[PDB]
Design a protein around this ligand. Sequence first.
Ligand SMILES: O=c1[nH]c2[nH]c(=S)[nH]c(=O)c2[nH]1
Length: 112
Amino acid sequence: MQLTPFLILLRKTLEQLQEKDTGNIFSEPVPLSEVPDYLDHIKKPMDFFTMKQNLEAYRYLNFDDFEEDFNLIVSNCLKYNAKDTIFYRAAVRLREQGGAVLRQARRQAEKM
Ligand SMILES: O=c1[nH]c2[nH]c(=S)[nH]c(=O)c2[nH]1
């Protein structure tokens, strides 16, 4: 497997995942200045901007490490926010819509 086509695929996949987050509520880190208690039980914050930085820092060299950080976006949001909030339901919807995006991307990857 060559690195360049794989990273091209992860760039496209990340774009597709971001497209499912229509509110852009996961686009940037959770602002600790406005959610001061966030790090109390969120041990590894994650967001799409950070994922793009990690991608270009060559920190995703296989599909599972990329998918792991996407799952953190979802799981952190489910953990922090009460079930009856817009945030929690947005994470549920992202988990659902992102799963199809990830399965199709991984099919593409395994063909490489
Ligand atoms: O109360 C909350 N504010 C915020 N902000 C962001 S960016 N993500 C959240 O899960 C959240 N929960």
